[PDB]
mmCIF file with all atom_site columns, all heavy atoms in Angstrom:
data_model
loop_
_atom_site.group_PDB
_atom_site.id
_atom_site.type_symbol
_atom_site.label_atom_id
_atom_site.label_alt_id
_atom_site.label_comp_id
_atom_site.label_asym_id
_atom_site.label_entity_id
_atom_site.label_seq_id
_atom_site.pdbx_PDB_ins_code
_atom_site.Cartn_x
_atom_site.Cartn_y
_atom_site.Cartn_z
_atom_site.occupancy
_atom_site.B_iso_or_equiv
_atom_site.pdbx_formal_charge
_atom_site.auth_seq_id
_atom_site.auth_comp_id
_atom_site.auth_asym_id
_atom_site.auth_atom_id
_atom_site.pdbx_PDB_model_num
ATOM 1   N N   . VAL Z 1 1  ? 9.780  -20.899 26.811 1.00 0.00 ? 1  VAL Z N   1
ATOM 2   C CA  . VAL Z 1 1  ? 10.722 -21.078 27.931 1.00 0.00 ? 1  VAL Z CA  1
ATOM 3   C C   . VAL Z 1 1  ? 10.586 -22.495 28.507 1.00 0.00 ? 1  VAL Z C   1
ATOM 4   O O   . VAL Z 1 1  ? 11.588 -23.206 28.642 1.00 0.00 ? 1  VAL Z O   1
ATOM 5   C CB  . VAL Z 1 1  ? 10.510 -19.980 29.032 1.00 0.00 ? 1  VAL Z CB  1
ATOM 6   C CG1 . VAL Z 1 1  ? 11.122 -20.381 30.381 1.00 0.00 ? 1  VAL Z CG1 1
ATOM 7   C CG2 . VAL Z 1 1  ? 11.086 -18.653 28.575 1.00 0.00 ? 1  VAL Z CG2 1
ATOM 8   N N   . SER Z 1 2  ? 9.334  -22.896 28.809 1.00 0.00 ? 2  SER Z N   1
ATOM 9   C CA  . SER Z 1 2  ? 8.976  -24.205 29.364 1.00 0.00 ? 2  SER Z CA  1
ATOM 10  C C   . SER Z 1 2  ? 9.544  -25.374 28.541 1.00 0.00 ? 2  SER Z C   1
ATOM 11  O O   . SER Z 1 2  ? 10.045 -26.328 29.136 1.00 0.00 ? 2  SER Z O   1
ATOM 12  C CB  . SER Z 1 2  ? 7.464  -24.324 29.505 1.00 0.00 ? 2  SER Z CB  1
ATOM 13  O OG  . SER Z 1 2  ? 6.844  -24.041 28.263 1.00 0.00 ? 2  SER Z OG  1
ATOM 14  N N   . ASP Z 1 3  ? 9.527  -25.274 27.188 1.00 0.00 ? 3  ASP Z N   1
ATOM 15  C CA  . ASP Z 1 3  ? 10.063 -26.332 26.318 1.00 0.00 ? 3  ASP Z CA  1
ATOM 16  C C   . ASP Z 1 3  ? 11.575 -26.515 26.446 1.00 0.00 ? 3  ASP Z C   1
ATOM 17  O O   . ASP Z 1 3  ? 12.061 -27.649 26.409 1.00 0.00 ? 3  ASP Z O   1
ATOM 18  C CB  . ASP Z 1 3  ? 9.682  -26.091 24.848 1.00 0.00 ? 3  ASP Z CB  1
ATOM 19  C CG  . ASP Z 1 3  ? 8.194  -26.174 24.578 1.00 0.00 ? 3  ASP Z CG  1
ATOM 20  O OD1 . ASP Z 1 3  ? 7.503  -26.933 25.285 1.00 0.00 ? 3  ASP Z OD1 1
ATOM 21  O OD2 . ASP Z 1 3  ? 7.726  -25.497 23.653 1.00 0.00 ? 3  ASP Z OD2 1
ATOM 22  N N   . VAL Z 1 4  ? 12.318 -25.393 26.584 1.00 0.00 ? 4  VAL Z N   1
ATOM 23  C CA  . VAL Z 1 4  ? 13.775 -25.397 26.717 1.00 0.00 ? 4  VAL Z CA  1
ATOM 24  C C   . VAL Z 1 4  ? 14.173 -26.003 28.081 1.00 0.00 ? 4  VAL Z C   1
ATOM 25  O O   . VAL Z 1 4  ? 15.132 -26.771 28.148 1.00 0.00 ? 4  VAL Z O   1
ATOM 26  C CB  . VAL Z 1 4  ? 14.376 -23.983 26.459 1.00 0.00 ? 4  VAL Z CB  1
ATOM 27  C CG1 . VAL Z 1 4  ? 15.899 -23.997 26.534 1.00 0.00 ? 4  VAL Z CG1 1
ATOM 28  C CG2 . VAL Z 1 4  ? 13.918 -23.433 25.104 1.00 0.00 ? 4  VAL Z CG2 1
ATOM 29  N N   . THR Z 1 5  ? 13.398 -25.713 29.144 1.00 0.00 ? 5  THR Z N   1
ATOM 30  C CA  . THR Z 1 5  ? 13.622 -26.276 30.487 1.00 0.00 ? 5  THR Z CA  1
ATOM 31  C C   . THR Z 1 5  ? 13.268 -27.775 30.490 1.00 0.00 ? 5  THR Z C   1
ATOM 32  O O   . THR Z 1 5  ? 13.877 -28.545 31.216 1.00 0.00 ? 5  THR Z O   1
ATOM 33  C CB  . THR Z 1 5  ? 12.882 -25.489 31.577 1.00 0.00 ? 5  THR Z CB  1
ATOM 34  O OG1 . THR Z 1 5  ? 11.475 -25.714 31.448 1.00 0.00 ? 5  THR Z OG1 1
ATOM 35  C CG2 . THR Z 1 5  ? 13.191 -23.992 31.546 1.00 0.00 ? 5  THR Z CG2 1
ATOM 36  N N   . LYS Z 1 6  ? 12.324 -28.182 29.639 1.00 0.00 ? 6  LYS Z N   1
ATOM 37  C CA  . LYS Z 1 6  ? 11.940 -29.586 29.468 1.00 0.00 ? 6  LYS Z CA  1
ATOM 38  C C   . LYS Z 1 6  ? 13.025 -30.372 28.705 1.00 0.00 ? 6  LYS Z C   1
ATOM 39  O O   . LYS Z 1 6  ? 12.989 -31.600 28.681 1.00 0.00 ? 6  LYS Z O   1
ATOM 40  C CB  . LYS Z 1 6  ? 10.560 -29.726 28.814 1.00 0.00 ? 6  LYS Z CB  1
ATOM 41  C CG  . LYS Z 1 6  ? 9.398  -29.420 29.752 1.00 0.00 ? 6  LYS Z CG  1
ATOM 42  C CD  . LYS Z 1 6  ? 8.051  -29.584 29.018 1.00 0.00 ? 6  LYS Z CD  1
ATOM 43  C CE  . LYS Z 1 6  ? 6.897  -29.373 29.962 1.00 0.00 ? 6  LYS Z CE  1
ATOM 44  N NZ  . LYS Z 1 6  ? 6.107  -28.169 29.601 1.00 0.00 ? 6  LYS Z NZ  1
ATOM 45  N N   . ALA Z 1 7  ? 14.006 -29.659 28.115 1.00 0.00 ? 7  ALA Z N   1
ATOM 46  C CA  . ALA Z 1 7  ? 15.159 -30.268 27.455 1.00 0.00 ? 7  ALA Z CA  1
ATOM 47  C C   . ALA Z 1 7  ? 16.368 -30.311 28.437 1.00 0.00 ? 7  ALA Z C   1
ATOM 48  O O   . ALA Z 1 7  ? 17.445 -30.784 28.069 1.00 0.00 ? 7  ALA Z O   1
ATOM 49  C CB  . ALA Z 1 7  ? 15.515 -29.502 26.180 1.00 0.00 ? 7  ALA Z CB  1
ATOM 50  N N   . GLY Z 1 8  ? 16.164 -29.832 29.666 1.00 0.00 ? 8  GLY Z N   1
ATOM 51  C CA  . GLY Z 1 8  ? 17.177 -29.829 30.722 1.00 0.00 ? 8  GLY Z CA  1
ATOM 52  C C   . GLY Z 1 8  ? 17.874 -28.511 31.040 1.00 0.00 ? 8  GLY Z C   1
ATOM 53  O O   . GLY Z 1 8  ? 18.722 -28.475 31.939 1.00 0.00 ? 8  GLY Z O   1
ATOM 54  N N   . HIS Z 1 9  ? 17.545 -27.416 30.324 1.00 0.00 ? 9  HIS Z N   1
ATOM 55  C CA  . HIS Z 1 9  ? 18.185 -26.122 30.591 1.00 0.00 ? 9  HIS Z CA  1
ATOM 56  C C   . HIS Z 1 9  ? 17.535 -25.376 31.745 1.00 0.00 ? 9  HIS Z C   1
ATOM 57  O O   . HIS Z 1 9  ? 16.390 -25.658 32.085 1.00 0.00 ? 9  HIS Z O   1
ATOM 58  C CB  . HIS Z 1 9  ? 18.247 -25.241 29.336 1.00 0.00 ? 9  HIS Z CB  1
ATOM 59  C CG  . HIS Z 1 9  ? 19.160 -25.792 28.297 1.00 0.00 ? 9  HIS Z CG  1
ATOM 60  N ND1 . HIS Z 1 9  ? 20.513 -25.541 28.328 1.00 0.00 ? 9  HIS Z ND1 1
ATOM 61  C CD2 . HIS Z 1 9  ? 18.885 -26.581 27.233 1.00 0.00 ? 9  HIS Z CD2 1
ATOM 62  C CE1 . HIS Z 1 9  ? 21.024 -26.192 27.293 1.00 0.00 ? 9  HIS Z CE1 1
ATOM 63  N NE2 . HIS Z 1 9  ? 20.081 -26.830 26.609 1.00 0.00 ? 9  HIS Z NE2 1
ATOM 64  N N   . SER Z 1 10 ? 18.270 -24.433 32.350 1.00 0.00 ? 10 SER Z N   1
ATOM 65  C CA  . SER Z 1 10 ? 17.775 -23.624 33.475 1.00 0.00 ? 10 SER Z CA  1
ATOM 66  C C   . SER Z 1 10 ? 17.533 -22.174 33.020 1.00 0.00 ? 10 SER Z C   1
ATOM 67  O O   . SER Z 1 10 ? 17.914 -21.820 31.908 1.00 0.00 ? 10 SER Z O   1
ATOM 68  C CB  . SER Z 1 10 ? 18.767 -23.675 34.632 1.00 0.00 ? 10 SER Z CB  1
ATOM 69  O OG  . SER Z 1 10 ? 19.924 -22.913 34.333 1.00 0.00 ? 10 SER Z OG  1
ATOM 70  N N   . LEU Z 1 11 ? 16.928 -21.341 33.882 1.00 0.00 ? 11 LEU Z N   1
ATOM 71  C CA  . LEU Z 1 11 ? 16.594 -19.940 33.578 1.00 0.00 ? 11 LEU Z CA  1
ATOM 72  C C   . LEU Z 1 11 ? 17.820 -19.037 33.354 1.00 0.00 ? 11 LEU Z C   1
ATOM 73  O O   . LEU Z 1 11 ? 17.694 -18.028 32.667 1.00 0.00 ? 11 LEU Z O   1
ATOM 74  C CB  . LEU Z 1 11 ? 15.638 -19.340 34.643 1.00 0.00 ? 11 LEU Z CB  1
ATOM 75  C CG  . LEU Z 1 11 ? 14.319 -20.125 34.900 1.00 0.00 ? 11 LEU Z CG  1
ATOM 76  C CD1 . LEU Z 1 11 ? 13.426 -19.394 35.896 1.00 0.00 ? 11 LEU Z CD1 1
ATOM 77  C CD2 . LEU Z 1 11 ? 13.536 -20.364 33.603 1.00 0.00 ? 11 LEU Z CD2 1
ATOM 78  N N   . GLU Z 1 12 ? 19.003 -19.422 33.890 1.00 0.00 ? 12 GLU Z N   1
ATOM 79  C CA  . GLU Z 1 12 ? 20.264 -18.700 33.705 1.00 0.00 ? 12 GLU Z CA  1
ATOM 80  C C   . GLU Z 1 12 ? 20.631 -18.623 32.231 1.00 0.00 ? 12 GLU Z C   1
ATOM 81  O O   . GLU Z 1 12 ? 21.354 -17.715 31.835 1.00 0.00 ? 12 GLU Z O   1
ATOM 82  C CB  . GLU Z 1 12 ? 21.402 -19.333 34.521 1.00 0.00 ? 12 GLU Z CB  1
ATOM 83  C CG  . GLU Z 1 12 ? 21.346 -18.948 35.992 1.00 0.00 ? 12 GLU Z CG  1
ATOM 84  C CD  . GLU Z 1 12 ? 21.694 -20.046 36.976 1.00 0.00 ? 12 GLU Z CD  1
ATOM 85  O OE1 . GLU Z 1 12 ? 22.840 -20.551 36.934 1.00 0.00 ? 12 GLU Z OE1 1
ATOM 86  O OE2 . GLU Z 1 12 ? 20.832 -20.360 37.830 1.00 0.00 ? 12 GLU Z OE2 1
ATOM 87  N N   . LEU Z 1 13 ? 20.112 -19.553 31.408 1.00 0.00 ? 13 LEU Z N   1
ATOM 88  C CA  . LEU Z 1 13 ? 20.347 -19.464 29.970 1.00 0.00 ? 13 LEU Z CA  1
ATOM 89  C C   . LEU Z 1 13 ? 19.121 -18.908 29.232 1.00 0.00 ? 13 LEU Z C   1
ATOM 90  O O   . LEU Z 1 13 ? 19.276 -18.001 28.419 1.00 0.00 ? 13 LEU Z O   1
ATOM 91  C CB  . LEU Z 1 13 ? 20.815 -20.801 29.346 1.00 0.00 ? 13 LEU Z CB  1
ATOM 92  C CG  . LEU Z 1 13 ? 20.864 -20.838 27.793 1.00 0.00 ? 13 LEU Z CG  1
ATOM 93  C CD1 . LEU Z 1 13 ? 22.021 -19.995 27.233 1.00 0.00 ? 13 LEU Z CD1 1
ATOM 94  C CD2 . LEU Z 1 13 ? 20.881 -22.247 27.270 1.00 0.00 ? 13 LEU Z CD2 1
ATOM 95  N N   . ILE Z 1 14 ? 17.922 -19.453 29.512 1.00 0.00 ? 14 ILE Z N   1
ATOM 96  C CA  . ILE Z 1 14 ? 16.711 -19.115 28.767 1.00 0.00 ? 14 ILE Z CA  1
ATOM 97  C C   . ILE Z 1 14 ? 16.197 -17.684 29.078 1.00 0.00 ? 14 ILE Z C   1
ATOM 98  O O   . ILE Z 1 14 ? 15.710 -17.046 28.154 1.00 0.00 ? 14 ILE Z O   1
ATOM 99  C CB  . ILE Z 1 14 ? 15.610 -20.227 28.845 1.00 0.00 ? 14 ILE Z CB  1
ATOM 100 C CG1 . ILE Z 1 14 ? 14.459 -19.979 27.859 1.00 0.00 ? 14 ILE Z CG1 1
ATOM 101 C CG2 . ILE Z 1 14 ? 15.096 -20.482 30.240 1.00 0.00 ? 14 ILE Z CG2 1
ATOM 102 C CD1 . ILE Z 1 14 ? 14.836 -20.113 26.356 1.00 0.00 ? 14 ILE Z CD1 1
ATOM 103 N N   . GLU Z 1 15 ? 16.389 -17.140 30.290 1.00 0.00 ? 15 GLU Z N   1
ATOM 104 C CA  . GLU Z 1 15 ? 15.995 -15.746 30.569 1.00 0.00 ? 15 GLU Z CA  1
ATOM 105 C C   . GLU Z 1 15 ? 16.809 -14.755 29.677 1.00 0.00 ? 15 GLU Z C   1
ATOM 106 O O   . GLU Z 1 15 ? 16.181 -14.043 28.891 1.00 0.00 ? 15 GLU Z O   1
ATOM 107 C CB  . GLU Z 1 15 ? 16.102 -15.419 32.079 1.00 0.00 ? 15 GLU Z CB  1
ATOM 108 C CG  . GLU Z 1 15 ? 16.333 -13.952 32.442 1.00 0.00 ? 15 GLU Z CG  1
ATOM 109 C CD  . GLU Z 1 15 ? 16.869 -13.700 33.842 1.00 0.00 ? 15 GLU Z CD  1
ATOM 110 O OE1 . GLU Z 1 15 ? 17.800 -14.419 34.277 1.00 0.00 ? 15 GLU Z OE1 1
ATOM 111 O OE2 . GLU Z 1 15 ? 16.351 -12.774 34.510 1.00 0.00 ? 15 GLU Z OE2 1
ATOM 112 N N   . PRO Z 1 16 ? 18.169 -14.723 29.685 1.00 0.00 ? 16 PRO Z N   1
ATOM 113 C CA  . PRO Z 1 16 ? 18.855 -13.773 28.783 1.00 0.00 ? 16 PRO Z CA  1
ATOM 114 C C   . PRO Z 1 16 ? 18.707 -14.124 27.302 1.00 0.00 ? 16 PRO Z C   1
ATOM 115 O O   . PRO Z 1 16 ? 18.931 -13.250 26.459 1.00 0.00 ? 16 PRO Z O   1
ATOM 116 C CB  . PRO Z 1 16 ? 20.318 -13.797 29.249 1.00 0.00 ? 16 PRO Z CB  1
ATOM 117 C CG  . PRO Z 1 16 ? 20.477 -15.061 29.993 1.00 0.00 ? 16 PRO Z CG  1
ATOM 118 C CD  . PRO Z 1 16 ? 19.137 -15.451 30.541 1.00 0.00 ? 16 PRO Z CD  1
ATOM 119 N N   . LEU Z 1 17 ? 18.325 -15.390 26.977 1.00 0.00 ? 17 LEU Z N   1
ATOM 120 C CA  . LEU Z 1 17 ? 18.112 -15.781 25.581 1.00 0.00 ? 17 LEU Z CA  1
ATOM 121 C C   . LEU Z 1 17 ? 16.880 -15.058 25.052 1.00 0.00 ? 17 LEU Z C   1
ATOM 122 O O   . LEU Z 1 17 ? 16.936 -14.497 23.966 1.00 0.00 ? 17 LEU Z O   1
ATOM 123 C CB  . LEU Z 1 17 ? 17.989 -17.315 25.387 1.00 0.00 ? 17 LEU Z CB  1
ATOM 124 C CG  . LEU Z 1 17 ? 17.645 -17.811 23.953 1.00 0.00 ? 17 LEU Z CG  1
ATOM 125 C CD1 . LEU Z 1 17 ? 18.665 -17.307 22.914 1.00 0.00 ? 17 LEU Z CD1 1
ATOM 126 C CD2 . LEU Z 1 17 ? 17.566 -19.336 23.902 1.00 0.00 ? 17 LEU Z CD2 1
ATOM 127 N N   . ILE Z 1 18 ? 15.787 -15.040 25.850 1.00 0.00 ? 18 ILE Z N   1
ATOM 128 C CA  . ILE Z 1 18 ? 14.538 -14.339 25.521 1.00 0.00 ? 18 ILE Z CA  1
ATOM 129 C C   . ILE Z 1 18 ? 14.816 -12.827 25.400 1.00 0.00 ? 18 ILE Z C   1
ATOM 130 O O   . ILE Z 1 18 ? 14.343 -12.194 24.459 1.00 0.00 ? 18 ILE Z O   1
ATOM 131 C CB  . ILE Z 1 18 ? 13.434 -14.683 26.566 1.00 0.00 ? 18 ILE Z CB  1
ATOM 132 C CG1 . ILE Z 1 18 ? 13.043 -16.191 26.508 1.00 0.00 ? 18 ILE Z CG1 1
ATOM 133 C CG2 . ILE Z 1 18 ? 12.204 -13.760 26.448 1.00 0.00 ? 18 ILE Z CG2 1
ATOM 134 C CD1 . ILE Z 1 18 ? 12.115 -16.668 25.281 1.00 0.00 ? 18 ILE Z CD1 1
ATOM 135 N N   . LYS Z 1 19 ? 15.629 -12.281 26.320 1.00 0.00 ? 19 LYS Z N   1
ATOM 136 C CA  . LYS Z 1 19 ? 16.025 -10.867 26.333 1.00 0.00 ? 19 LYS Z CA  1
ATOM 137 C C   . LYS Z 1 19 ? 16.769 -10.527 25.042 1.00 0.00 ? 19 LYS Z C   1
ATOM 138 O O   . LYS Z 1 19 ? 16.506 -9.479  24.448 1.00 0.00 ? 19 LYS Z O   1
ATOM 139 C CB  . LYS Z 1 19 ? 16.872 -10.541 27.571 1.00 0.00 ? 19 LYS Z CB  1
ATOM 140 C CG  . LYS Z 1 19 ? 17.016 -9.056  27.846 1.00 0.00 ? 19 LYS Z CG  1
ATOM 141 C CD  . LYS Z 1 19 ? 17.307 -8.766  29.313 1.00 0.00 ? 19 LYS Z CD  1
ATOM 142 C CE  . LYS Z 1 19 ? 17.298 -7.278  29.585 1.00 0.00 ? 19 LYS Z CE  1
ATOM 143 N NZ  . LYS Z 1 19 ? 17.596 -6.973  31.010 1.00 0.00 ? 19 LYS Z NZ  1
ATOM 144 N N   . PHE Z 1 20 ? 17.641 -11.449 24.579 1.00 0.00 ? 20 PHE Z N   1
ATOM 145 C CA  . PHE Z 1 20 ? 18.394 -11.287 23.343 1.00 0.00 ? 20 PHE Z CA  1
ATOM 146 C C   . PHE Z 1 20 ? 17.466 -11.309 22.126 1.00 0.00 ? 20 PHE Z C   1
ATOM 147 O O   . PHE Z 1 20 ? 17.647 -10.507 21.221 1.00 0.00 ? 20 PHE Z O   1
ATOM 148 C CB  . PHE Z 1 20 ? 19.500 -12.365 23.218 1.00 0.00 ? 20 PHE Z CB  1
ATOM 149 C CG  . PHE Z 1 20 ? 20.151 -12.426 21.855 1.00 0.00 ? 20 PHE Z CG  1
ATOM 150 C CD1 . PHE Z 1 20 ? 21.223 -11.598 21.541 1.00 0.00 ? 20 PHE Z CD1 1
ATOM 151 C CD2 . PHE Z 1 20 ? 19.691 -13.313 20.885 1.00 0.00 ? 20 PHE Z CD2 1
ATOM 152 C CE1 . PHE Z 1 20 ? 21.808 -11.638 20.276 1.00 0.00 ? 20 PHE Z CE1 1
ATOM 153 C CE2 . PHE Z 1 20 ? 20.261 -13.332 19.611 1.00 0.00 ? 20 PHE Z CE2 1
ATOM 154 C CZ  . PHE Z 1 20 ? 21.312 -12.493 19.315 1.00 0.00 ? 20 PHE Z CZ  1
ATOM 155 N N   . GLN Z 1 21 ? 16.503 -12.246 22.092 1.00 0.00 ? 21 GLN Z N   1
ATOM 156 C CA  . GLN Z 1 21 ? 15.551 -12.415 20.984 1.00 0.00 ? 21 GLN Z CA  1
ATOM 157 C C   . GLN Z 1 21 ? 14.703 -11.147 20.767 1.00 0.00 ? 21 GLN Z C   1
ATOM 158 O O   . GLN Z 1 21 ? 14.579 -10.682 19.631 1.00 0.00 ? 21 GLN Z O   1
ATOM 159 C CB  . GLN Z 1 21 ? 14.670 -13.656 21.217 1.00 0.00 ? 21 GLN Z CB  1
ATOM 160 C CG  . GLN Z 1 21 ? 15.442 -14.998 21.133 1.00 0.00 ? 21 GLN Z CG  1
ATOM 161 C CD  . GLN Z 1 21 ? 16.097 -15.267 19.789 1.00 0.00 ? 21 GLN Z CD  1
ATOM 162 O OE1 . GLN Z 1 21 ? 15.619 -14.859 18.737 1.00 0.00 ? 21 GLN Z OE1 1
ATOM 163 N NE2 . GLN Z 1 21 ? 17.220 -15.947 19.792 1.00 0.00 ? 21 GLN Z NE2 1
ATOM 164 N N   . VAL Z 1 22 ? 14.187 -10.562 21.868 1.00 0.00 ? 22 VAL Z N   1
ATOM 165 C CA  . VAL Z 1 22 ? 13.418 -9.305  21.875 1.00 0.00 ? 22 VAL Z CA  1
ATOM 166 C C   . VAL Z 1 22 ? 14.309 -8.167  21.363 1.00 0.00 ? 22 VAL Z C   1
ATOM 167 O O   . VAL Z 1 22 ? 13.919 -7.464  20.430 1.00 0.00 ? 22 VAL Z O   1
ATOM 168 C CB  . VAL Z 1 22 ? 12.819 -9.018  23.281 1.00 0.00 ? 22 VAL Z CB  1
ATOM 169 C CG1 . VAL Z 1 22 ? 12.185 -7.624  23.355 1.00 0.00 ? 22 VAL Z CG1 1
ATOM 170 C CG2 . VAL Z 1 22 ? 11.809 -10.089 23.662 1.00 0.00 ? 22 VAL Z CG2 1
ATOM 171 N N   . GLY Z 1 23 ? 15.497 -8.024  21.954 1.00 0.00 ? 23 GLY Z N   1
ATOM 172 C CA  . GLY Z 1 23 ? 16.479 -7.012  21.557 1.00 0.00 ? 23 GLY Z CA  1
ATOM 173 C C   . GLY Z 1 23 ? 16.793 -7.051  20.068 1.00 0.00 ? 23 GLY Z C   1
ATOM 174 O O   . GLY Z 1 23 ? 16.739 -6.019  19.384 1.00 0.00 ? 23 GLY Z O   1
ATOM 175 N N   . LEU Z 1 24 ? 17.038 -8.262  19.536 1.00 0.00 ? 24 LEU Z N   1
ATOM 176 C CA  . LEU Z 1 24 ? 17.309 -8.465  18.108 1.00 0.00 ? 24 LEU Z CA  1
ATOM 177 C C   . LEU Z 1 24 ? 16.057 -8.188  17.242 1.00 0.00 ? 24 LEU Z C   1
ATOM 178 O O   . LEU Z 1 24 ? 16.166 -7.570  16.180 1.00 0.00 ? 24 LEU Z O   1
ATOM 179 C CB  . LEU Z 1 24 ? 17.831 -9.896  17.900 1.00 0.00 ? 24 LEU Z CB  1
ATOM 180 C CG  . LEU Z 1 24 ? 18.242 -10.338 16.484 1.00 0.00 ? 24 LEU Z CG  1
ATOM 181 C CD1 . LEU Z 1 24 ? 19.313 -9.410  15.890 1.00 0.00 ? 24 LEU Z CD1 1
ATOM 182 C CD2 . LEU Z 1 24 ? 18.769 -11.757 16.518 1.00 0.00 ? 24 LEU Z CD2 1
ATOM 183 N N   . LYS Z 1 25 ? 14.871 -8.616  17.704 1.00 0.00 ? 25 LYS Z N   1
ATOM 184 C CA  . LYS Z 1 25 ? 13.622 -8.380  16.972 1.00 0.00 ? 25 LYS Z CA  1
ATOM 185 C C   . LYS Z 1 25 ? 13.337 -6.860  16.827 1.00 0.00 ? 25 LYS Z C   1
ATOM 186 O O   . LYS Z 1 25 ? 12.933 -6.404  15.752 1.00 0.00 ? 25 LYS Z O   1
ATOM 187 C CB  . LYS Z 1 25 ? 12.433 -9.123  17.640 1.00 0.00 ? 25 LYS Z CB  1
ATOM 188 C CG  . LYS Z 1 25 ? 11.284 -9.429  16.680 1.00 0.00 ? 25 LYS Z CG  1
ATOM 189 C CD  . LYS Z 1 25 ? 11.599 -10.616 15.774 1.00 0.00 ? 25 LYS Z CD  1
ATOM 190 C CE  . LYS Z 1 25 ? 10.455 -10.963 14.877 1.00 0.00 ? 25 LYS Z CE  1
ATOM 191 N NZ  . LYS Z 1 25 ? 10.706 -12.239 14.168 1.00 0.00 ? 25 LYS Z NZ  1
#
């Protein structure tokens, strides 16, 4: 998560992205 925010993104994208990754896994 920290690396994606270090590229300029916020939690509004990276929080549901992680949720999607778990769901797909």
Side-chain angles (χ1 to χ4, degrees):
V1 161
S2 54
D3 295 330
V4 183
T5 70
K6 285 180 176 115
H9 293 275
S10 73
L11 305 184
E12 281 141 61
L13 171 72
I14 190 68
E15 154 199 44
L17 175 56
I18 295 284
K19 195 155 186 181
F20 169 86
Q21 292 299 329
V22 172
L24 182 56
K25 205 77 177 189

